Design a protein around this ligand. Structure first.
Ligand SMILES: [Ca+2]
Ligand SMILES: [Ca+2]
Ligand SMILES: [Ca+2]
Ligand SMILES: [Ca+2]
Ligand SMILES: [Ca+2]
Ligand SMILES: [Cl-]
Lengths: 25, 25, 25, 25
């Protein structure tokens, strides 16, 4: 388990990557 | 809970994203 | 130990960096 | 505490930011 702040940041990071990929495709 | 180093890095990462967004807006 | 989601995000982040480096080299 | 992999990724992430800043300055 992780700090809820870290879980939040990890999710935001992944969604950022996904949106970036979709933008370029 | 997380290592204090990881908590620090997560906060820095989020603030980086926020500042980037504000810069572009 | 960390949340499996955070472990996943950390791995993705590192592989992203590696691929970026290889792309530029 | 965190998974050693996550600690490693957090350190790499921060050093990446620092080097980027120094490069631009
Ligand atoms: Ca806490
Ligand atoms: Ca420690
Ligand atoms: Ca933990
Ligand atoms: Ca969980
Ligand atoms: Ca492990
Ligand atoms: Cl963690």
């Amino acid at each position: 388990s992780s700090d809820p702040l870290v879980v939040a940041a990890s999710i935001i990071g992944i969604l950022h990557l996904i949106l970036w990929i979709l933008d370029r495709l």
